[model samples]
Target: SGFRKMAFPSGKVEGCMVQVTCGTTTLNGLWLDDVVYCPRHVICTSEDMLNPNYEDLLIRKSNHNFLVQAGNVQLRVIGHSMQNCVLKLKVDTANPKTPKYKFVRIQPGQTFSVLACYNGSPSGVYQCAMRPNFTIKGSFLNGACGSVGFNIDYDCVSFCYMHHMELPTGVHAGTDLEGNFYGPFVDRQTAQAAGTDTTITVNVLAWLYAAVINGDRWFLNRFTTTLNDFNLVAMKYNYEPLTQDHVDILGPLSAQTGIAVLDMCASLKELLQNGMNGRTILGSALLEDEFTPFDVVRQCSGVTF
Candidate 1:
């Protein structure tokens, strides 16, 4: 195959529809489908395809013709394992805000494109490096897919490598604590009354929530359903303009921009809810069922009225 002009440095493309041209018939296997796969797995169905299931990372079109749109986009190369693979990706070819592609090396192709969303997570950086076994391993440029994909066969094994290897790290924006509180804050009443028993419960629940987030199959499917519904309501009303009646009802706690902060919490919570399939968010109510709110009167008894 004749060489096409390569422009981009790191091989990251942007946009809704990507345009890729081949230099010759031999390069037919290097079609758009060859490069990008859908939904992140091997599932075959229109619903899965529409959702961009990237099960088969190396997807081949029925006729080797590829569609570059909003799919679980992946890039797979066979043919010659050239030093720097000549690839083209155009992010939103029709939209200027989208990215364009240029030829880049598989070695240093670690990138995080904003447009890459598959499954519930954002698209992560990947690089195809020559493994010790000689075949190229299309490894995550960062440490994502640690729990999914073809890599799952060696998840615990690969994650162990992450501890020793110096892969580039991606930083997610720090979330305000109110939206998703995982710990340190428990029901004060339970801690006070139950003593060691409360401590045990707190520790167990803390571990349970962490395990749930980390793919513990048992706890999550059981507890999260109702929490999601209740949170849906809390999210809905968190942002209503505070009435004088609300001000009177809330008393001193409603001072300043407290209500506005509540509004922000509501907005953030709702945004987080989109990530939830059906699991309920754990919150004060869960703690309430187990214990009561910390009584300020009991803690700070300076003077008697």
Candidate 2:
């Protein structure tokens, strides 16, 4: 399942606000106020549907088109047309325009999983299509759009959570939901030296965990600096303006993320001030990794809602 921070109509952080108006659109949908749930579908739009080659694989089902469901690391297609039909399914890890397409086949009343992956990398978008007399049922945008909900992946970073998928291992480089890069660094020192807040927060938490595991003090100075950088950004953005409360709940949730990091870092700092290393601290139980940035927001839903 996925996780989402819902906005309230009361101008206070709380459960999902019911039927709140957004422009002319009345925001009423499942999990609009719930904290976490896995999404069911990724909708396409008419404006950009014909632009991609994969749109050819769609089959029109009388008055409506087919909907694409989020699968495990792939997209799922269920036959919606009344009659049984043959379809050529193609999937790609990149955009649908890319030539590197993987293929599959499906029939009426059957579900097909399009594997758009390569080499076990779970860090890219999946684009797919079924061929010959296809029809689309939802918005036809150029990119994948799912139910705007939140869920934290195994990595502890939160996003508009969709289907359950396993994360790729040994990743040296990746991006967040905002398309921010988290790696391509030669080592931890270089990553910390770069001073990007997200890079610092994620890496510092891992590093601090490692420092505790190794009983090391050499990284304390840089750790403090990076932690401060993360907190500063978090605090700054906590005050950032919001045009509409529900429009982007993730922004404020990000502030809570910063708070969570600061809380953890402050605890680590206290340990160092008291002169405890990994060996003593491990047994003393001063370190904790059970909570993440999003978890903090979930804990006090009202404060950040």
Candidate 3:
């Protein structure tokens, strides 16, 4: 194998570099060319000496890809293993009944690009899941297929506000400032009930309603951010908005915002007394069954109240 050999530093005293016909014969040599060998194990190789034993499947956003955008979203799956693998992508759209699925076979050391809902609606609500060919082992569920997922509001303006305003009753409850409640200075019933100073009973809901309608930049941003946060929570749990459960959870909390903080507290107390989880309370009709003068209060309470 073209190995090199060198003589010992000490002066030679016998034939064949022998030492007084010692008990055993020994030889030494070395090989180069980045090769290694083990005679006992019969192993030899010249492959890269710095390779990892196992490489994991990686799903990440590409330099040019994005998770949320106005039109579409892009992603990439990098296969780092020694063998080819399958990648599965599933999308649950605004229409839950008709989910979409995609699959791609990725070779080792390859990157597969996935553009979900390439031509789908910009305002559509979507939750997505990525399943790799490999399985992950865990105490709870062995051989569970490894996956990653995220939710998307491709067009925030097109979908989020509209969805937020839609009630379970199939109605878009408008935030009409002047039509109902006798005007913006409408008293805060919650404040009054809390025994706070009567003069301080001002309508936070009306203020918010006016800000949103007047296109107040700061107000709009705050409003949208809250809705986005709410949607993120729902998407994380794969829950649909406007569902019966959603109605139960959001409806009551929305209704309580008009009253004092004390009243809000009492309302929540009443809910728990009646066997309602936070989940049950949000959608409860007891929350939305009867109409209140301040619908905006419901909107405000639904998020922060």
Ranking by TM-score: 2, 3, 1
lDDT of 1: 0.24
Error of 3 at 172 (Å): 35
Per-model TM-score, in order, reads 0.17, 0.23, 0.18
Clashes of each: 23, 21, 11
After superposing candidate 3, which stretches have Cα over 4 Å from the reference?
Answer: 1-148, 155-257, 260-262, 274-305
Estimate, for each residue in 1-305, the C-alpha lDDT of model 2 and write its tens digit: 12222221221111211111112221111112111111111111333222422224333222123222222233322222111111212222222222111112221111111111221212232221111111111121211221221232222212321221111221112122222222332211121222222221332243344333335444344333344444455345331121222113234443433333344455445443454545533233343222233333444443432
lDDT of each: 0.24, 0.26, 0.20
Query: Model 1, 157-269: lDDT tens per residue?
Result: 11101100111222121001111111221111112111111111211222223323334322222122233454455445332223233324323322322333233223333
| Number of residue pairs clashing in candidate 3, backbone atoms closer than 3 angstroms, sequence gap of 3 or more or interchain | 11
Query: What is the lDDT for 97 in model 2?
Result: 20
Best by lDDT: 2
Candidate 3 residue lDDT tens string, 44-124: 111311221212212222222212111222222121111111111111222112122222222111111111111122111
Worst 10 residues of 3 by lDDT: 13-22
Give the Å shift of residue 126 in candidate 1: 6.7
The list of candidate 2 runs beyond 4 A from truth reads 1-53, 59-159, 164-294, 297-305
